[PDB]
Amino acid sequence: GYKTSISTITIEDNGRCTKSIPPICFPDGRP
């Protein structure tokens, strides 16, 4: 589901580190 290619639909973001649970520098997060 996560697009590798950047897509600034409103804000610029991709990969990096999550700002929620679980806090990890991986493209995965719990809703």
| Residue position matching structure tokens 């580190």 | 17
Q: Which residues contact 22 (CB under 8 A, 6 or more apart)?
A: 28, 29, 30
User: In this structure, is the dihedral angle defined by the CA atoms of residues 21, 31, 17 and 24, taken in order, positive or negative?
Assistant: positive
Q: What is the DSSP string of 1-31?
A: ---SS---SSS---SS--SSSS-SSSS----
Residues 1 and 7: their CA atoms lie apart, in Å, by 13
The answer to whether 27 and 15 are in contact (CB under 8 A) is yes
Method: NMR
The answer to whether 16 and 23 are in contact (CB under 8 A) is no
